[PDB]
């Protein structure tokens, strides 16, 4: 109902952490609660922060990827940049990155870019995984990836970008996105020949 | 045993039974089983009957299978009790096979050629092995 | 199977390990291609994603060892897929494709070409 | 409701009481039915299904209103307990329960009367007639346990209610039902088996004959 009554939800979110019930909860329930709290633009951020801190190391060690992406998306849309939880997410993503679907990779890239996460090697490995499945990407994933804030830094290597560049021209059809990607190409480390050739078809 | 005799006579006449009535008799079999334990041979008799007029209630078959297993288990436990109590006191191929056959007949009260079909039908039902 | 006799069991029970799969959101407040060489980890989602490059899919199911069966939507979705996606690469599990040119209906289709030709052969033998 | 203490008949009084107890919270007043409390308490003979209707009306009291009418609840408890005690030993010719033959008919009645306990708070006692009526139901089921279970519709649905009652006596009957079932070799769906196993765990009963059956069935 998009019912904004945050002074009521604050009581429930205080109870969740007062009774130490934030640790035994199932991961999927957490990934749904936080995503819902990121839908009405919750205000009392400190309570959500204390809720995030409670969950221990054991829980993050073996969470499935599908609730993990929901949790990171809820953190990003809530504009949270907790330091010691991003390292947990980063090292946990090492073992399950192959299992991510193309939509999940597209979501994760921009969700991490929007929270100021600066561990370059994990974003590079995510970009490599995305380029591996380049033929398997649809329009929505292209919008979520190429429309990310500051994607120019993630266009670093030649072999990690070209594999998806074509698909981008072939599939997406909104002219605004075409001009956005054409403008973003100019601020990377790609060579001039490749940039010129890509913009020869991209702009339109 | 009177109800088992009823079942086998009804089978002999090759009638088309009111399956619900057969299931009711099967349920009451366990009611009467408390007074006197049904034998392994009568129980397998009832099993083959209820098979051959297309009974499909499961539970009646389950009770008979468990009764047969109970008879076998009780016989084996009695034999082991006898051996333990004895402990507490302190062509040739046919010659070997006669002991095995007599032990089998003494224990399960049935031939192997028919035990091996009871196991076949139990596997067909998909019971947990 | 008869011994289950409609009992849902623990697979269909309401255990806390079953609601975990339910990632819907908890909002409202309650002819066929035989493909081999895949990996057992490869989900059916990845299967649909790869082979929809050729044609649409109604049903698909994996088996142990990478064997799997896929049913197409239309005959055109098959006629392209029988020869296009052969030996393509996916997740280090290069596929090998075979097609059941004989179908549960196409066998009855072959029965008549068998029997009329048999009648012709019998006429030849009599002559 | 003030005048109907003497300008109403017992049937109309209990029917009106049922109607009022079924109504929503926003239009319920205690003083109105506090008079119906002593009006309907008096009675001589009433049908089993009608006294079941009175039990249902006793259930339907709204929870916030429930503490306010605790005294009326207790008086109704005493009356219905006395009536059911007189009714159990009546023959089936007059509708009594001792001449009954089926399992569904009883389990529709003792279930309601046993679920009727969850009205008074834990820090309060129970009416003597109510306890004696529970004892009477226990005796009435222990005297004919064998025919109730052997029905096509087994009475296992009544098992939780008896275990809900703090009265230990009821636990013996509840265990006896499953004991006879184990001696009968019935089969249950796995959910019911797990529920019975959990019930065994909570109340830590120490029967051995049913232990083997529970082990094999689990």
Instruction: Tell me the CA distances in angstroms from D36 to A60, D40, D97, D103, one per residue in order.
Output: 62, 6, 28, 34
| B with C: touching (≥3 Cβ pairs within 8 Å) | yes
Mention every residue, 6+ apart, whose C-beta is less than 8 A from residue D128. D78
What is the C-alpha separation between C82 and C33, in angstroms, rounded?
7
User: Is B58's CB within 8 Å of C1's CB?
Assistant: no
Residue A163, SS3 per DSSP: helix
Mention every residue, 6+ apart, whose C-beta is less than 8 A from residue C102. C110
H or E element at residue A109: helix A102-113
Mention every residue, 6+ apart, whose C-beta is less than 8 A from residue C18. none
Interface test mutation site (partner D, options B19, B23, B26, B30, max chain D beta carbons within 10 A): B30
In angstroms, the separation between the Cα of residue C10 and the nearest Cα of chain B is 15
Contact C20, A28 (CB under 8 A): yes
What is the C-alpha separation between A38 and A74, in angstroms, rounded?
6
For residue C90, give both structure tokens.
């996916």
Burial of residue B33 (CB within 10 Å: 0-12, 13-18, 19+) is middle
User: Is A32's CB within 8 Å of C25's CB?
Assistant: yes
For residue C62, give both structure tokens.
């994996």
Give me the sheet containing C32-36, strands edge to edge.
C57-62, C68-72, C32-36, C96-99
Subunits in contact with chain A (3 or more CB pairs closer than 8 Å): C
- Number of Cβ within a 10 Å radius of residue D51: 20
- For the CA atoms of A146, A152, A156, A160, the dihedral, rounded to the nearest 10 degrees, stands at 0
For residue B36, give both structure tokens.
């006197």
Q: Within 13 Å and on the Cβ side, how many CA atoms surround D23?
A: 15
Cα radius of gyration (chain B): 18
Q: How many helices (H) and strands (E) does chain B have?
A: 6, 0
D201 touches chain C (CB under 8 A): no
B63 touches chain D (CB under 8 A): yes
Mention every residue, 6+ apart, whose C-beta is less than 8 A from residue D118. D164
In angstroms, the separation between the Cα of residue C21 and the nearest Cα of chain B is 27
User: Is B126's CB within 8 Å of C3's CB?
Assistant: yes
Contact A68, A89 (CB under 8 A): yes
Q: Are strands C68-72 and C32-36 parallel, antiparallel or unpaired?
A: antiparallel
- Please give the DSSP secondary-structure letter assigned to residue A187: T
Solved by what technique?
cryo-EM
Handedness of CA C67, C70, C75, C79 (dihedral sign): negative
H or E element at residue C34: strand C32-36
In angstroms, the separation between the Cα of residue A28 and the nearest Cα of chain C is 6
At residue A28's C-alpha, the angle toward residues A25 and A32, to 5°, is 100
Which residues of chain D have a CB within 8 Å of the CB of C10?
190
What is the C-alpha separation between B69 and B127, in angstroms, rounded?
14
DSSP string, A33-98: HHHHHTTTT---HHHHHHHHHHS-HHHHTS--HHHHHHHHHHHHHTT---HHHHHHHHHHHHHHGG
Show me where chain B is broken: residue before each gap, C-N > 2.5 A: 90
Q: Of A80, A57, A138, nearest to A104 (Cα)? A: A138
Q: Within 13 Å and on the Cβ side, how many CA atoms surround B5?
A: 2
Which residues of chain D have a CB within 8 Å of the CB of B67?
185
Contact A138, A171 (CB under 8 A): yes
What is the C-alpha separation between A32 and A69, in angstroms, rounded?
11
Mention every residue, 6+ apart, whose C-beta is less than 8 A from residue C40. C62, C64, C65, C66
What is the C-alpha separation between A74 and A40, in angstroms, rounded?
11
D93 touches chain C (CB under 8 A): no
Mention every residue, 6+ apart, whose C-beta is less than 8 A from residue C67. C34, C35, C36, C38
What is the C-alpha separation between A29 and A163, in angstroms, rounded?
37
Using an 8 Å CB-CB cutoff, list residues of chain B that contact chain C.
Answer: 56, 58, 125-127
Longest dimension (CA), chain B: 61
Longest dimension (CA), chain A: 61
Mention every residue, 6+ apart, whose C-beta is less than 8 A from residue C46. A101, C90, C91
What is the C-alpha separation between A99 and A115, in angstroms, rounded?
23
Handedness of CA A124, A126, A129, A130 (dihedral sign): negative
Contact A38, A70 (CB under 8 A): no
Mention every residue, 6+ apart, whose C-beta is less than 8 A from residue A140. A103, A106
**Residue whose pair of structure tokens reads 């204390």 in the numeric block:** A50
What is the experimental resolution, given in Å to one decimal place?
3.7
Ranges of H-type helices in C1-127: 44-51, 75-84, 106-126
What is the C-alpha separation between B32 and B11, in angstroms, rounded?
21
H or E element at residue A176: helix A175-185
């Amino acid at each position: 109902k998009v019912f904004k009554q945050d002074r009521i939800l604050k009581q429930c979110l205080d109870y969740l952490v007062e009774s130490n019930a934030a640790v035994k909860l199932s991961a999927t329930s957490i990934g749904a609660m936080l995503n819902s709290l990121a839908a009405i633009r919750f205000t009392y951020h400190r309570s959500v922060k204390q809720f995030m801190i409670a969950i221990s190391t054991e829980q993050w060690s073996e969470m499935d990827a599908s609730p993990l992406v929901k949790i990171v998306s809820a953190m990003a849309k809530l504009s949270l940049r907790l330091p010691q939880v991003l390292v947990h997410v980063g090292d946990r993503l090492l073992d399950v990155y192959t299992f991510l679907s193309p939509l999940d990779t597209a979501l994760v890239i921009n969700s991490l870019q929007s929270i100021g996460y600066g561990n370059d090697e994990v974003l590079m490995m995510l970009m490599r995984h995305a380029a591996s499945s380049a033929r398997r990407w649809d329009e929505v994933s292209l919008t979520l990836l190429f429309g990310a804030s500051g994607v120019h830094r993630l266009l670093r290597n030649v072999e990690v970008a070209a594999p998806l560049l074509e698909q981008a021209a072939g599939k997406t059809s909104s002219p605004h996105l075409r001009q956005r990607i054409a403008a973003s190409l100019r601020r990377s480390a790609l060579p001039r020949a490749l940039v010129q050739s890509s913009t020869s078809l991209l702009t339109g | 045993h009177e109800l088992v005799r009823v079942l086998t006579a009804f089978a002999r006449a090759k009638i088309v039974p009111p399956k619900r009535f057969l299931a009711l008799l099967g349920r009451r079999f366990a009611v009467l089983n408390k007074r006197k334990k049904l034998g392994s041979l009568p129980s397998y008799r009832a099993f083959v009957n209820l098979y051959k007029m297309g009974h499909d209630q499961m539970n009646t078959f389950r009770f008979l299978a468990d009764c047969i297993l109970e008879t076998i288990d009780s016989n084996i436990k009695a034999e082991k009790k006898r051996l333990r109590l004895a402990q507490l006191q302190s062509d040739p191929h046919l010659l070997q096979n006669l002991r095995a056959r007599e032990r089998f007949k003494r224990l399960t009260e049935l031939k192997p050629s028919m035990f091996t079909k009871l196991l076949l039908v139990l596997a067909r039902f998909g019971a947990p092995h | 199977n008869p011994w289950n006799d409609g009992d849902a069991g623990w697979r269909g029970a309401a255990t806390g390990a079953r609601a975990n799969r339910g990632r819907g959101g908890f909002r409202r407040g309650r002819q066929r291609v035989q493909v081999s060489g895949l990996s057992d980890e490869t989900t059916w989602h990845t299967l649909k994603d790869h082979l929809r490059q050729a044609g649409e899919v109604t049903f698909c199911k994996v088996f142990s060892g990478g064997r799997a069966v896929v049913e197409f939507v239309t005959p055109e979705d098959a006629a392209r897929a029988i020869t296009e996606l052969q030996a393509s690469e996916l997740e280090g599990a290069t596929l090998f494709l075979r097609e059941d040119r004989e179908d549960t209906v196409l066998v009855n289709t072959r029965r008549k070409i068998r029997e009329v030709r048999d009648a012709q052969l019998r006429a030849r033998k009599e002559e | 409701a003030i005048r109907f203490a003497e300008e109403s008949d017992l049937f109309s009084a209990v029917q009106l009481f049922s109607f009022i107890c079924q109504q929503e919270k926003e239009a319920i007043s205690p003083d109105a039915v506090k008079c119906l409390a002593e009006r309907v308490i008096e009675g001589k003979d009433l049908d089993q299904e009608t006294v079941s209707v009175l039990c249902r009306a006793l259930r339907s009291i709204p929870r916030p209103h429930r503490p306010e009418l605790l005294r009326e609840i207790g008086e109704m408890m005493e009356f219905l307990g006395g009536e059911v005690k007189e009714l159990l030993e009546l023959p089936v010719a007059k509708g009594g329960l001792k001449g009954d033959v089926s399992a569904g008919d009883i389990q529709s009645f003792i279930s309601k009367f046993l679920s009727l306990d969850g009205l008074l708070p834990a820090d309060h006692d129970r009416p003597g007639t109510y306890m004696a009526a529970i004892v009477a139901c226990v005796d009435y089921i222990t005297e004919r346990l064998e025919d109730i279970v052997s029905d096509e519709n087994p009475p296992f649905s009544i098992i939780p209610h008896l275990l809900n009652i703090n009265m230990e006596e009821t636990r013996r009957c509840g265990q006896a039902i499953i004991r006879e079932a184990a001696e009968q070799g019935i089969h249950f769906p796995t959910l019911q088996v797990f529920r019975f196993l959990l019930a065994l765990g909570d109340h830590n009963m120490r029967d051995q004959r049913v232990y083997r059956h529970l082990r094999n069935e689990f």
